[PDB]
Design a protein around this ligand. Sequence first.
Ligand SMILES: NCCOB(c1ccccc1)c1ccccc1
Ligand SMILES: NCCOB(c1ccccc1)c1ccccc1
Lengths: 95, 491, 166
Amino acid sequence: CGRFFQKHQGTCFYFGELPLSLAACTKQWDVVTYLLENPHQPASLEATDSLGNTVLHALVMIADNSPENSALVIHMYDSLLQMGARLCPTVQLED
Amino acid sequence: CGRFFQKHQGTCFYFGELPLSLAACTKQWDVVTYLLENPHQPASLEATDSLGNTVLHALVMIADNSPENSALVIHMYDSLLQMGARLCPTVQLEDICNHQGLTPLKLAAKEGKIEIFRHILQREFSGLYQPLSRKFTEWCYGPVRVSLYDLSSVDSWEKNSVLEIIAFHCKSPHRHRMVVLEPLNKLLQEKWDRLIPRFFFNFACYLVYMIIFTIVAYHQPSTFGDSMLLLGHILILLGGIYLLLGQLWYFWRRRLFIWISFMDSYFEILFLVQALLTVLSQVLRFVETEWYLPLLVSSLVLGWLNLLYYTRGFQHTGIYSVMIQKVILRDLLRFLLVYLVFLFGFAVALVSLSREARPVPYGGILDASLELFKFTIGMGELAFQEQLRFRGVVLLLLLAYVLLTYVLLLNMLIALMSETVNSVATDSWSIWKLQKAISVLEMENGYWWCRRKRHRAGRLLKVGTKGDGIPDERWCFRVEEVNWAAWEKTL
Amino acid sequence: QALLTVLSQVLRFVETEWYLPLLVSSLVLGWLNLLYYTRGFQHTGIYSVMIQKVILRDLLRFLLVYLVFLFGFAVALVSLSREARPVPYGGILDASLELFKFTIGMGELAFQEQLRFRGVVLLLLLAYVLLTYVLLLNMLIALMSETVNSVATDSWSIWKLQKAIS
Ligand SMILES: NCCOB(c1ccccc1)c1ccccc1
Ligand SMILES: NCCOB(c1ccccc1)c1ccccc1
């Protein structure tokens, strides 16, 4: 939680300030898997950032109207939702 | 160096009058190689022609806007630059001033070449040949990219720059499209945002001067009030002479601008005329003549019309002013030509008649012309003159005139202006950007009396390492851009 | 409109001479507001949206240029015609009204034989009518034609949004 990552006016890049969010928003479908299913310390998928955003929220914010960005965000969103449902069905991340 | 090769009008082909230039411009990547690497007598790559052009200059001149020609010139230019760097790195061929004193970038800008000019403006290479690069990329952390374009010989700080050459020296039909490209757009936008205060201060000062002029001209001759009138008069005279000095200094400094495009600005002439009228009106009032009021009122009108020059400094109004100018120059003078022909013909026709009876309307040419213009303005007096013996002839002539003018000409003019407005939509934005760029360049230079100190924008950011020892420095213009098409291909 | 109505009633209770202006202004504003309700139809809401879009897009630039030209020419004419050889162009209000008459379709373009600057006044009037009655108004017609052509589907979308808000 610094200044570059914060969503503001100027030089910035917002990704939810979380390693899993950084991987997902970066189109990195491999390290996200390892972080999810690393036996040493699996990363909780419902952990939030300072502003209250979650991984899905972070995926939403960086979304734009560019066809390529829209496709990337759609694919990552769907895949992450399916995976999260497969890990901990008891919690609805959409809410 | 004869007649066919020399760049002129007629049967001609220019290739720099050098065998290597002929080979390169001819798309012959083989004999150029042999000439460069022939052991018996290698051909120097920095040898010039009579005009001072070099091989790169020759490649630039023959460049056109055709996609195939642009691609050919781009490929040959890049390959030859790489080869020259590989042969004699100690000499930078990109910096070779010909007789006129221009480099390939400056020459490409002046000659109107856009494709090759833009390609030279923003080009990048791999790790090898990296120094031969204008565009760079510091890091690509995430989807953002931080580009750093070189600002050597393109910034306004230099005595001669690409911005100045495009603004005041280029005479291409659509040079206004050369100021919308990458940091010639962003750089100009930054300069404009930094210089807004100067522009609006100038606008406010001019408005104050015009308001004083109006007040003096309203409560003018036909104690305290007399002293106020006198001080207003002296202030107006001082303002007029100061405007005259400024405009004369501008013309003296840019005296090689009018022949390129008189109508590009066409506003400095108006300011000069207004100042001349004001000063001359004051002098003739000193002479106590009856022609003081006409000149003074004409100056007042011209100033209040000139204020549009300042009001076109906004996105929403500059485009409207540009459209006004384009319509005026495109389709309003043909309409006037046809209108005056018809009006003079019908006016003299009506004057010839109505001169034989069985307050005389159509007594002269002025009266008939005024009546016809009243027809055109919406107050046509179309009656049945029962006094003159040619009632029917006069009535039919008036009906024919109104049918030919009030139905065809004016409504057709409406339609033609609709078409013209539809045609010029994006060109309006480009021309507005060019006008704003010219205003920025003029403001950057100080007034005719105060020598404004130059502000050399850009960051002295060390880029890469040249093929030498101690490293190099180069001023650049940082530009951040969020891109995913390029970022998705870096993985 | 509600503020004007209530305040007009209060000032009438005060027995002032400014009751009629405020009351009539309220009446006019209400009759104009009725368009809010009339734009509840497919065929009329789009027209109202187009009216608003044209007003906001290209009618204020025209007014800016118009008022600049009109004030300049009005004060110019008032300065003249003040020296002879019912005085037209007596003040600024009269000259402005005469120019607006030119623009509305009842321009009084005559040869004033009384003032000593006949030709100057006539040429100024001719220049004004040429610059305003030919360029500005017909150009405004063309610009509104372009604007109407531009906003066709956006008009439907904005009408749908307005109906959703209602
Ligand atoms: N001469 C006053 C300013 O020029 B304008 C004009 C009027 C007189 C002569 C030629 C042109 C005009 C053109 C564009 C914007 C505003 C008006
Ligand atoms: N003020 C009356 C209603 O607004 B309208 C209008 C009139 C006065 C001030 C500004 C706008 C108008 C715009 C669209 C539809 C109908 C008329």
